[PDB]
Write a protein that binds this ligand. Structure first.
Ligand code: HEM
Length: 247
């Protein structure tokens, strides 16, 4: 990574937008949606072709219409008046900043943030985000092969589901992973380990972590050691927020 220089005015806008985003996301109870927005923005990166990734394209109707993005229109429209207060910021940075803030305000680790991503004109093709009905090979095709993230990243990042819930009108899955879906903690992993449970969701892709010999040791470590989860989580979210950026 070689991070670009931005003006002092750009930096001031980042700092002030970070603060506004905290109060906004906290009062609106939308941290999970905003984290999902940031992931769906970044996760389309394909290292092979250098296409996709966290470049502001998620606001384009063409990208909002991807079925994986059901409901992200709401996230995008919720942020528009606040974004209008910071016209200097790229959409790319703004949506990644909303992701970082979503983790922080729910009590998660502080993910280092570097400004300067440029807004690209071209949304990636649909079909690159993970499929919750699939298993380990698939997650490795999505996170490893396309994104260029590690197996440690895959498991730590699945920890993002520690906040939030699925919606039957969005993915078709329904419910929270955790009893405290607005609190950033290691509950995702402890829930996974205690198996199926009334009124908590587990996806087939979550189950795939429990039977992989590389993913399972990590699920165990995060279930047992929240600090270790926070540190690996922060590292993985940083890498994710920076795919294709500043290489
Ligand atoms: C590992 C592959 C992944 C799969 C298969 C997956 C799948 C899903 C699905 C199906 C939903 C439900 C959407 C809905 O119906 O509202 C969801 C929600 C969510 N995902 Fe993921 N996801 C993955 C990775 C990630 C990552 C890496 C993050 C970011 C750290 C993330 C953050 C979230 C959040 C915050 C929600 C909750 C949204 C809300 O409460 O409205 N996910 N995910």
């Amino acid at each position: 990574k070689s991070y670009p220089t931005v003006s002092a005015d750009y930096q001031d806008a980042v700092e002030k937008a970070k603060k506004k985003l905290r109060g906004f996301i906290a009062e609106k109870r939308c941290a999970p949606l905003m984290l999902r927005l940031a992931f769906h923005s970044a996760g389309t990166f394909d290292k092979g072709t250098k296409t996709g990734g966290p470049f502001g394209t998620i606001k384009h109707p063409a990208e909002l219409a991807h079925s994986a993005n059901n409901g992200l229109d709401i996230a995008v429209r919720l942020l528009e008046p606040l974004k209008a207060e910071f016209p200097i910021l790229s959409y790319a940075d703004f949506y990644q900043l909303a992701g970082v803030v979503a983790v922080e305000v729910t009590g998660g680790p502080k993910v280092p943030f570097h400004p300067g991503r440029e807004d690209k004109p071209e949304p990636p093709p649909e079909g690159r985000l993970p499929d919750p009905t699939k298993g380990s090979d698939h997650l490795r095709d999505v996170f490893g092969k396309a994104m260029g993230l590690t197996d440690q990243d895959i498991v730590a990042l699945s920890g993002g589901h520690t906040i939030g819930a699925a919606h039957k009108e969005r993915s078709g899955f329904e419910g929270p992973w955790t009893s405290n879906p607005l609190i950033f903690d290691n509950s995702y992993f402890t829930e996974l380990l205690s198996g199926e449970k009334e009124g908590l969701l587990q996806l087939p892709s979550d189950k795939a972590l429990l039977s992989d010999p590389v993913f399972r040791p990590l699920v165990d470590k995060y279930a047992a050691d929240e600090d270790a989860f926070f540190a690996d989580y922060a590292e993985a979210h940083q890498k994710l927020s920076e795919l294709g950026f500043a290489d």
